[PDB]
Design a protein around this ligand. Sequence first.
Ligand SMILES: [Zn+2]
Ligand SMILES: [Zn+2]
Length: 59
Amino acid sequence: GSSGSSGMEPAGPCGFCPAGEVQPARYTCPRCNAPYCSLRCYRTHGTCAENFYSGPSSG
Ligand SMILES: [Zn+2]
Ligand SMILES: [Zn+2]
């Protein structure tokens, strides 16, 4: 299982999605490196966003 040089990592097939509805996860969770097709999954995969914003808004 070789590994690509360290620098720029390509996208990944959003697995969180339901079998069949596999989309190219162009983005990834900057907290858990989780490839998500869109914001929708980004929230389903995990609740990392909660402790990410880092703003005085959260309650
Ligand atoms: Zn998805
Ligand atoms: Zn995450």
